[PDB]
Design a protein around this ligand. Structure first.
Ligand code: NAG
Ligand code: NAG
Ligand code: NAG
Ligand code: NAG
Ligand code: NAG
Ligand code: NAG
Ligand code: NAG
Lengths: 66, 412, 98, 49, 49
C-alpha cells in the first residue's frame, strides 16, 4: 500500500509505503523485483517472499602503491 | 615556409553538466475527474477506456526514468575503494573524493551542487529506485577505479598502476613524448590543483552555471500547477464544483452540465500526458548522451575532438547533481609559441630524407627536427629520418648535412 | 490571422562570415585552431599530415604533389557542375520548407 | 596465401546536405480562434489557460 | 482542436530537426575541425578534409 502510514489498513514499513506479506531480511543480494527507495523483493527459501535492501556489487579494493 | 610551434603548455579543467531524468509521477483518472462522486463516475464510465492508457503511458515514463539512471551510473561491476594513504605523485584530489569526516558521505563539490539547486487530487509522486547515497557509492567507485587503475577496469579485471605513469601514458596518447611529464611533474601538479580550486569558486559564486538542471524542475512544476488550475474553471458550465451542480439542479440537466465538466477535464489530462511524453523523449536523448560520455570519456582517453572539452583530452571525473551528472574534463592546451622556418626534406647525398615523426624547423642558421606539439629540438641523424628517392621531385627541399652515429665509432 | 513570422537572429551575412572564418582557419592553420591558439603551417605540410594520419606515408604526397593538385581541382569543378545541373540536389532542405 | 595490394589512388569530394533550423512562426490564440469580437473573449475566458 | 493538433505536430517536427542539428554540430566539430577515423561518418573512403 502506497504512502499510508499503515496504522490504518507480516507487516513491514518503508519510504514507499507499507507492504504486508514479506519478512525483512537483514542480508543483501542482487535486486529481483524493484519495490522502491532502495528496497526490493524476491522469492527465496519453506520458501517465502522476502523484501531486503539492494546490493551494489561485491566489494573490492586494489592494492595500489607507487 | 613558416611554421609556428608552441613552446609551453597549460592544463585546464572544465565543467560539463547533463540532466539524466525527471520526477516519476502518476495521476488517477477517476479521482481527478470525479473524486468522491457517484453520478460523475457513472457518466465517465460510458467514455470507453480513455483513462487506462493514461496510466499505461505514465507507468512507461516512470520505469523509463529508472532505466535512465541505471544505465548512466551503473557501469562498474564491483565497488572499489581508494587506498588509505594518499600519495598520488603530488596531485591532490581531496576536493572530489568523498570525505569520511563529512556527516553525509559526499565530496565538497557534490555538497555545493546539492545546496545550489532547489497537489493532492490524486497527484502522486513515486520515489526513485536508487537513492542518493547509492549514487554516491557508484560515483566513488568510478573515481577510485579511475584513480588507481586507469581505463583498465572497464575492459576486464582492474589492474593497478602508479598515477604519474598513468598520466605519462595519457600524454603519450596525444602525440607528446612522456619525458615532458616526467620532467614537469611539479608544474603540472600545481596547475591541476589550482584548476580544481578555481572550479569550486567559479561554480559556487556564479549561481546560473547549472541552470540547465534548475530549468527542468521549474518547467515540470509549471505543468502540474496548470493542471490543478483546471479544476477551478467551469468550461462553459454553470459552476466549477460537482456538489453545487447536483444540489441546485435535477439529473435531467445535471447530466448535461457534468458532461461538460468531464469533457473539459479529460482534454486537460490528455494535453498533460502528451506534453510529458515529448519531454521524456528529449530527456532520454540527453541520458543516452550522458551514457556515451561516461563510456568513451570517463572510462577511456577519447580522440573525438570537442567531445570532451575544448583542447586535447586527458581525463574526466564524474560528480552527481540532483537529477543529473556533472563532468570535470581535464584537458591540455598549448600556450606559448614561436616562429620558425620549415622544410619538407633534406637532400644530403642526393637522396631525400623525410622525418619519421616531427617537423624540420630551423632558427637563423641551424636545422633541427622537433616534435609537433612542444618545441624540443634534436640534431638530425639517421635514427629519425627515413630515405626515399633522389632530390628532384620535391618542391622545397633544402640542402644540409645529416649526421651518422656509426661513422665516429668506426673511426676508432 | 495572427500568423506572425519572426526574423532569425543571425543574418545570412553573419553566417557567411562564420563559414569564411572556418575556411580560412582550416586552410592556414589546420586542426590546431580548434584546440587553442591558431598556428600557421604551409598547405602541402598539412596535406602530408592528413595523408600520414591514414597509414600512407608522406613521401607519396611530396612526390605526387602535382597530380594530387590536379585531381583536387577537377573534383571541385565537377561538384559545381553536378549540383548545378541536377534539380533534386537540395531536396533534403526543400522538403522541410514544404 | 594471396594478397591484393593497390598501386594508385584517387581523391573524391562528396557533398553532404543537412537541415539545421526551421521557420520561426508564432500564432496568437484569441485572434486566431476568433478576434475582433466580444462574445468570443467572454465565452473563451472560461475554457481555461 | 485545430490549434492543438497543429502545435503538437510542430513540437514533434522541432524534435527531429533538433536531432539533425545536433548531428550537424558533431560533424562540424569532429570532421571540419579534426581528422576522423570512424568509417562512413565523413564520406565513403578514407577521410582527409
Ligand atoms: C507516520 O510516519 C512517520 C514517518 O515519517 C513516523 O515517524 C510515524 O511513527 C508514523 N506514525 C504516526 C502516528 O505518525
Ligand atoms: C611554462 O608556463 C608556466 C606558467 O604557466 C611558467 O611558469 C613556466 O616557467 C613556463 N616554462 C618556461 C620554460 O618558461
Ligand atoms: C589537498 O588540498 C586541500 C585543499 O582543499 C588542502 O587543504 C590539503 O592540505 C591538501 N592535502 C595534501 C596532502 O596535499
Ligand atoms: C639558434 O639560436 C640562435 C638564435 O637565437 C642562432 O643564432 C643560432 O645560430 C641557432 N643555433 C644555435 C646552436 O644556437
Ligand atoms: C614560397 O613563395 C616564394 C614566392 O612565391 C617562392 O620564391 C618560394 O620558392 C616559395 N618557397 C618554397 C620552399 O617553395
Ligand atoms: C645542393 O647541393 C648541390 C650539389 O652540392 C647543388 O647543385 C645545389 O645547388 C645545392 N642547393 C642549395 C640550395 O645549395
Ligand atoms: C595513377 O592514376 C592516375 C590517374 O590518371 C594516372 O594518371 C597515373 O599515371 C597513375 N600512375 C601513377 C604511378 O601514379
Amino acid at each position: 500500500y502506497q504512502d499510508v502510514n499503515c496504522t490504518e489498513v507480516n507487516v513491514f514499513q518503508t519510504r514507499a509505503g507499507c507492504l504486508i506479506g514479506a519478512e525483512h531480511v537483514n542480508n543483501s543480494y542482487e535486486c529481483d523485483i524493484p519495490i522502491g527507495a532502495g528496497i526490493c523483493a524476491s522469492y527465496q527459501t519453506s520458501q517465502s517472499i522476502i523484501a531486503y535492501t539492494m546490493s551494489l556489487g561485491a566489494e573490492n579494493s586494489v592494492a595500489y602503491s607507487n | 615556409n613558416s611554421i609556428a610551434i608552441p613552446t609551453n603548455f597549460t592544463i585546464s579543467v572544465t565543467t560539463e553538466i547533463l540532466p539524466v531524468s525527471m520526477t516519476k509521477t502518476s495521476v488517477d483518472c477517476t479521482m481527478y475527474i470525479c473524486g468522491d462522486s457517484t453520478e460523475c463516475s457513472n457518466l465517465l464510465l460510458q467514455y470507453g477506456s480513455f483513462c487506462t492508457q493514461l496510466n499505461r503511458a505514465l507507468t512507461g515514463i516512470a520505469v523509463e526514468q529508472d532505466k535512465n539512471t541505471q544505465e548512466v551510473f551503473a557501469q562498474v561491476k564491483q565497488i572499489y575503494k581508494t587506498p588509505p594513504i594518499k600519495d598520488f605523485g603530488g596531485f591532490n584530489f581531496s576536493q572530489i573524493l568523498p570525505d569520511p569526516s563529512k556527516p553525509s558521505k559526499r565530496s565538497p563539490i557534490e555538497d555545493l551542487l546539492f545546496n545550489k539547486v532547489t497537489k493532492f487530487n490524486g497527484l502522486t509522486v513515486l520515489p526513485p529506485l536508487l537513492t542518493d547515497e547509492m549514487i554516491a557509492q557508484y560515483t566513488s567507485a568510478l573515481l577510485a577505479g579511475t584513480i588507481t587503475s586507469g581505463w583498465t577496469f572497464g575492459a576486464g579485471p582492474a589492474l593497478q598502476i602508479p598515477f604519474p605513469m598513468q598520466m605519462a601514458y595519457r600524454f603519450n596518447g596525444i602525440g607528446v613524448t612522456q619525458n615532458v611529464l616526467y620532467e614537469n611533474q611539479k608544474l603540472i601538479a600545481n596547475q591541476f590543483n589550482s584548476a580544481i580550486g578555481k572550479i569550486q569558486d567559479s561554480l559556487s559564486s556564479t549561481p546560473s552555471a547549472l541552470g540547465k538542471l534548475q530549468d527542468v524542475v521549474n518547467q515540470n512544476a509549471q505543468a502540474l500547477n496548470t493542471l490543478v488550475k483546471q479544476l477551478s474553471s467551469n468550461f462553459g458550465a454553470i459552476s466549477s464544483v460537482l456538489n453545487d451542480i447536483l444540489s441546485r439542479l435535477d439529473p435531467p440537466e445535471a447530466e448535461v452540465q457534468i458532461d461538460r465538466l468531464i469533457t473539459g477535464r479529460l482534454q486537460s489530462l490528455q494535453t498533460y500526458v502528451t506534453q510529458q511524453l515529448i519531454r521524456a523523449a528529449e530527456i532520454r536523448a540527453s541520458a543516452n548522451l550522458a551514457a556515451t560520455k561516461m563510456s568513451e570519456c570517463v572510462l577511456g582517453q577519447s580522440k573525438r575532438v570537442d567531445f570532451c572539452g575544448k583542447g586535447y583530452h586527458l581525463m574526466s571525473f564524474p560528480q552527481s547533481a540532483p537529477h543529473g551528472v556533472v563532468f570535470l574534463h581535464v584537458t591540455y592546451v598549448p600556450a606559448q609559441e614561436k616562429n620558425f622556418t620549415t622544410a619538407p626534406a633534406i637532400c644530403h647525398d642526393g637522396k631525400a630524407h623525410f622525418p619519421r615523426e616531427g617537423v624540420f624547423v630551423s632558427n637563423g642558421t641551424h636545422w633541427f627536427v622537433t616534435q609537433r606539439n612542444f618545441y624540443e629540438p634534436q640534431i638530425i641523424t639517421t635514427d629519425n629520418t627515413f630515405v626515399s628517392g633522389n632530390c628532384d621531385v620535391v618542391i622545397g627541399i633544402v640542402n644540409n648535412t645529416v649526421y651518422d652515429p656509426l661513422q665516429p665509432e668506426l673511426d676508432s
